[model samples]
Target: MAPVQKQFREFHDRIKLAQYDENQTLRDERDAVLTAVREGLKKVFADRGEAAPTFTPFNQGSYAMNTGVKPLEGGEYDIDVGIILNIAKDDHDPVEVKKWIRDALKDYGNGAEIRRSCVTVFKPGYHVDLAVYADPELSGGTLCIAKGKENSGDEHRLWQISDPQGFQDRIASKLSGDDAAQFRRCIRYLKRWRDFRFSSDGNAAPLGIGLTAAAYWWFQVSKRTDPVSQNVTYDDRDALEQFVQTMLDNFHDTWDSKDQRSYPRLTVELPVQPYNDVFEKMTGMQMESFKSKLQALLNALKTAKSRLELHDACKALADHFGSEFPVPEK
Candidate 1:
């Protein structure tokens, strides 16, 4: 096996063990950890020069608006904690903001360890992955500001999620077995492909692709299809499969046709470099090789079975990267 592949498998295995731990439920453990970390952050920030930050949960993990994947026992899972800060200007640099937050958290005396100088965590039992953002103005849950490097150079952006529990409820209420299956399949296939590519390439990576895949899956599977709004209903399995296939076809056609016009700005808004760096460190693969492997993996997903097999595949793929893809009860 290639060095990166071997590393990916090992990492995945560890995550599985963590997720599957029989002693503690993953969601319960995650909530407890996040609550502790959030409180600690509030205390640390109040002590610092900056205003106490408001922590919001975002992305495709547990906190995502439309996540269908359940927490697995003894598997590695990500709990994303977003710290939203009020800023005055569009030019507010996220790097500086990240640095300032890091400094404040470090002073909390909570045994916080800095990873990549951007993420901080509490010692012993719990830690939260951190991402700081400057909200232009709190328009409810809408966060508008100059997009960070993580956003792929898309400056002056608007990111909005519904009120608290809006996303969670939306996902839980709307997602059917088929939708969940399709989404899980995509995530599993993409992550697997990305790990393989990281093992092979040294220059280019597919961090953006992976993140995009996650986000888009959420949007498609959870987003309401009837009125094209927030309401979601249980969709038929055949319909869900068709929906997934259409998305896959669109991706392939766009890339193969090299149609620049087909691309949208929001498509590449998230930061890719950080994802590349993180994955490389975790899997020991150069960026460029990972890209190739990812494409191949995606191809496999396109042709694979369309039911729960995809979900199982996701678990298998996640195992390669020390992450958990938990099976949801039907």
Candidate 2:
């Protein structure tokens, strides 16, 4: 059996990010990185004897939306910060802007890696994601992001249109007060589930924003044979149950094709300019595997409800998540 009404809520509390007090500490670490990067850029621009390019550095993506979280694996915090520079598309090619950041911050010897997208700074106590972007003016009113992929030689850079601020702002605008907090908590739940399933494989797992867009548009479903009761989802347990079911439903069988599920084709559209598909990388029968695993966990939670004691529920949830979660007393 699954948990009673009170215990259902209790179980959600157990698995959520309550242990680390959520975003404040990460915010502090992120701010520190922001300051250092800005100061470095300031000096870099001054040295060139050019008026400093007007750039806005702030929080975006998961961290900015208050949906960013990590499972406190080590003593380090993980965060993403955004830097949007107001430069015309012609002023600097995509590669040059990325190169500029490297020149500015290279002195730290902080193991900065130039990824296909953002430049990452690895540091003690925390890791910071410095996502670099350009003014929307540079790319027809959406951010112009500098992107590079390595190949046989020095990879040519591309300026892609992105809308991080719009994503952060628009997704947030969907709910308010209790609804907002619950939505974020639901996201934390999915993230924990993501970690539980693939902590070892790491990057191979589904993207958090994919899960974010899933959670964001969980209600956007209209063609389903079965939809979970929205009113019941006003609580955490039912909400979580619906979340897993909703995600799996996207991959549910359509006639004969195991691949007929709507997940792969449907976009977790960001509802903004340069509308992004957060799950563009997801593919194949791996999705069925995901659905199966989620269904199994839901089954476990069902049994957890009827258990005579909290310890059994503890064990069940710990099995679904990990041993790191608090185990109830016998």
Candidate 3:
């Protein structure tokens, strides 16, 4: 019999990425991309003459937060990197900064493309999401919204409230200790599930930050020992069960009350600086689609819980979690 905790650990190892030999390749590739982008930016600024602005590159997002997980399909890693300009928010308009960074990539083209918040350069094995933020602002950095990086970029805008690094710091500070270790594992599991459900077929799934933050919140409030089994939250099978069920419960409560204010798009904002709602950018249909997907996963968990055999439970979980989740043979 596959013990629930042991098997869940196996499932987790399969989903989390970054240090294993194969994962290391993506790490190496991402660093390579970062080097090229940094060099490109430096040269671009120099070519503009002596008054050129200065920028510093630093890490951000899942990998930086330690919540990064391997994608079950397509690529194994989605890396978040950024350029932090040393110039003040007063130096240049948001649009000008975004344009500078965008035009900086004059000749270097490895799938170089711009987006609203960042520039993404893609590769077959991995993709680098490059965002530019200003460090010269108040307490934290400002996001430089791009105009042509959508089909090329989004609109050129600036968010004084944006603070990617602050949020990352928040997660890292709270995430420590034995329980915190379990918490990080649960984060990866949650992310993998998100990547599989949302990355294809015109599906509208939750974004990684919102998912990571919610899991972080859940981890902060929950106990290490299962309320029923009394097992410490090591394997994270229980944690995953509780986290998803609680999210379902929240949505269902809103449904029962017929409270339109308690909508998915209304609830679950970013848990830190910027404080944007997770579903803020999504359309109503997209929000509804995510809610439906969460419900389906909750339903699958219920069946998976009923199983007595390890393989049976794992197979059932694989239905929701994807093929990377291990199900041993009889």
Name the best candidate (by lDDT). 3
1 versus 3: better TM-score goes to = 3
What do the candidate models score in CA lDDT, each in turn? 0.40, 0.65, 0.66
Question: In candidate 3, where is summed lDDT lowest over 10 consecutive residues?
Answer: 145-154
Candidate 3: residue 20 lDDT (0-100):
23
Decide which is better by TM-score, 2 or 3: 3
- TM-score per candidate: 0.43, 0.77, 0.81
- Give the distance in Å from residue 24's predicted Cα in candidate 1 to where it truly belongs: 7.0
Clash-forming residue pairs, model 3: 114-149, 148-152, 148-153, 149-152, 149-153, 150-153
For TM-score, the strongest prediction is 3
| Model 2 C-alpha lDDT per residue in residues 1-330, reported as the tens digit of each score | 233435544545665432223556776666666666777778988899876676787776666676755554653455677788878765776667766776666766366667777777777756676777877766567667777743313455777777777777766887777677677777776677777786433444667777888887783321112265543234555566777777766753423267454432334666765677665555544555666677887877677667788788667766876665556688
Instruction: Name the lDDT value of residue 183 in candidate 2.
Output: 77
Q: 1-330, model 3: which lDDT tens digit per residue?
A: 237677767777777666323456656776777666666767776777655556676677877776667666565467787777766665655556666656666455454665666777766766677777666453143454333333433333553556677777778777568667677887777677777778542426677777777765666434466689877545466567788777755543234254355445425667765676665666556677777887787777777778887689888888877888888886
Q: Enumerate residue pairs that collide in model 2.
A: 1-303, 1-305, 1-306, 2-302, 2-304, 2-305, 2-306, 3-305
Task: Report how far residue 229 has shifted in candidate 3, in Å.
Answer: 16
Model 1 deviation from native, Cα RMSD in Å: 11.4
